[PDB]
């Protein structure tokens, strides 16, 4: 099924494939891709990468 994450800390994108995220946002349809320490997910209509220590998994 689908995995969602809560944003716990602000992060501004440093590369174009990264999300800019803000505390309180839910990132949806989260996937672990090949990259270590990062995740991929949907936010406000787009997809992108985000650091996995800025967010908490909704279980």
């Amino acid at each position: 099924s689908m995995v969602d994450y809560i944003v716990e800390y602000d992060y501004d994108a440093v590369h174009d494939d990264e999300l800019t995220i803000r505390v309180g946002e839910i990132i949806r349809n989260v996937k672990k891709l090949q990259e270590e320490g990062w995740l991929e997910g949907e936010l406000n209509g787009r997809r992108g990468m985000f650091p996995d220590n800025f967010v908490k998994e909704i279980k």
Partner: peptide, 10 residues
């Protein structure tokens, strides 16, 4: 306590 983003694979 603020997190530091892990390095990208790059």
């Amino acid at each position: 306590n603020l997190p530091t983003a892990p390095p990208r694979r790059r």
